[PDB]
Design goal:
This protein has one helix and no strands. The protein is an all-alpha fold. It has one domain. It is classed as antimicrobial protein. Keywords: ocellatin, antimicrobial peptide, alpha helix, amphipathic character, C-terminal carboxyamidation, antimicrobial protein. The assembly is monomeric.
Length: about 25
């Protein structure tokens, strides 16, 4: 449920950092 999905959040928010670098270079 929401509990499990919460795990994907850390991956999304954290994974977002990587995407930020892509937009830069």
């Amino acid at each position: 449920g929401v509990v499990d999905i919460l795990k994907g959040a850390a991956k999304d928010i954290a994974g977002h950092l990587a995407s930020k670098v892509m937009n830069k270079l």
